[model samples]
Target: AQQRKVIRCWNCGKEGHSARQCRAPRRQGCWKCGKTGHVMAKCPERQAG
Candidate 1:
């Protein structure tokens, strides 16, 4: 037999985990892309500016 532990999240009420090992409210991402390295005022898909 094996002990299958289920990791629960108390943030969005979901399972699994994140980089912070916990709930990261609105950590969804920037308003432009769903990734990091942006400051909302920048990031226009490409560095054409």
Candidate 2:
């Protein structure tokens, strides 16, 4: 039997997931501004602001 790897985000404290699936309220804001679906690293604001 093999063990399944569980993913989680250290920022939001969620289980079975990653930072990409963060749905909690971000005090510092997301990886991207004007967009509430993703983070700042994945935010378009860093590119086209």
Candidate 3:
């Protein structure tokens, strides 16, 4: 049988699930603000990608 891959989300940099299902927190490393609350894509200080 196949197993459920424990995919980690690049968004929160957390383990156990995907970014789409990530509810623990926002981006772990936002290239925009370099914070953990949001990602570069959702970065408040970031420009259009």
Candidate 4:
């Protein structure tokens, strides 16, 4: 048998959930602008501006 690795979010430090989940609270600003709620890759302002 093979072992399966679990997935976790580096942002909130939770398991079985991704950073995109709306339920996840904003602990700190994203990597882009230091703004809470969203991450750097998901930052629209960084992409447009």
Candidate 5:
């Protein structure tokens, strides 16, 4: 029996399954913001607007 590997998803950011099948809200973490549950790519600080 082949079991699924334990992976940290990039979508829901859970350590249960892959992001491909995430059923939760999309949230991510980034190093620039120094916070968890959001990404720096679309971060407000990065936009400087």
Candidate 6:
């Protein structure tokens, strides 16, 4: 049989890593407007202004 040994992130539920330095998004929303799919800084809302 094969073997598996590595750390997993409880926050994001991923393998080979920890939540302290996890790259996964904490929420399903944006960092500015609390929206989904895109960030405000990179969205049309910021650029249209």
- TM-score of each candidate structure, all chains considered together: 0.26, 0.31, 0.33, 0.33, 0.40, 0.34
Clashing pairs in 6: none
lDDT per residue as tens, model 5, 4-49: 6568764666677775786464444654553455567756654543
Q: Which window of ten consecutive residues has the lowest lDDT sum in model 2?
A: 26-35
Candidate 4 whole-model C-alpha lDDT, 0 to 1: 0.59
lDDT of 3 by residue, 1-49 (tens): 8755566665665557675776554456564456665666677774565
Evaluated at residue 32, the lDDT of candidate 3 is: 40
lDDT of 1 by residue, 1-49 (tens): 8856456543333457534565466553344454444646665665655
Ranking by lDDT: 3, 4, 5, 6, 2, 1
Tens-digit per-residue lDDT, 1-49, candidate 4: 7766457655555567666872456555574465676766676664554
Which of 4 and 6 is ahead in TM-score?
A: 6
Under the 3 Å rule for N, CA and C atoms, how many clashes does model 6 have?
Answer: 0
Better of 1 and 6 by TM-score: 6
Model 2, global lDDT: 0.55
Query: For residue 5, what is the lDDT in candidate 1?
Result: 47
lDDT tens digits by residue: candidate 2, 3-44: 555675544645567666665675234532445555666766
Name the candidate, 2 or 4, with the larger TM-score value: 4
Which runs in model 5 stand beyond 4 Å of their true positions? 1-6, 26-45
TM-score-better candidate, 2 vs 3: 3
Q: Highest lDDT: which candidate? A: 3
Clashing pairs in 2: 30-40, 31-39, 31-40, 31-41, 32-39, 32-40
Q: List lDDT for all candidates, in order.
A: 0.50, 0.55, 0.60, 0.59, 0.59, 0.56
> In candidate 1, where is summed lDDT lowest over 10 consecutive residues?
5-14
The TM-score measured for candidate 6 stands at 0.34
Could you tell which candidate, 1 or 3, scores higher by TM-score?
A: 3
